[PDB]
Amino acid sequence: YSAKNTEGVTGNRYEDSSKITGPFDMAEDKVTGTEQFRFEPNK
């Protein structure tokens, strides 16, 4: 019962937020390796 509430994917504590970071801020239309960009995790 009780409202199965379909809901999909959270990627909680992803560690991909672009901020002060420094070594990050790279994926920006670049690299193009693995899945760090593919099918963005739409938190």
Partner: protein, 90 residues
């Protein structure tokens, strides 16, 4: 011994096997648990480094969203507490 825990629940054993196969084909993650919650919920438990766990779990979510009834959530913990570990069966 990988401390980062990746761990995913899904509806049905087929999506669980999808997730586990993606785990073992994605990164340096060691599957540590495959348990049946009940009512069709099956959870997979893998260990590894933070980056490896993240990549593997996201690959599993990608490979699992469409198979069968599909997963309901994907979750990763980075620095798990040692007190939680007995609840996983150590």
């Amino acid at each position: 011994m990988g401390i980062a825990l990746g761990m995913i629940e899904t509806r049905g054993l087929v999506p669980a096997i999808e997730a586990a196969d993606a785990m073992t084909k994605a990164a340096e993650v060691r599957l540590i648990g495959r348990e049946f919650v009940g009512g069709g919920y099956v959870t997979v438990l893998v260990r590894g480094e933070t980056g490896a766990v993240n990549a593997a779990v996201r690959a599993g979510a990608d490979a699992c969203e469409r198979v069968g009834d599909g997963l309901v959530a994907a979750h990763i913990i980075a620095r798990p507490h040692r007190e939680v570990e007995p609840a996983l069966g150590n």
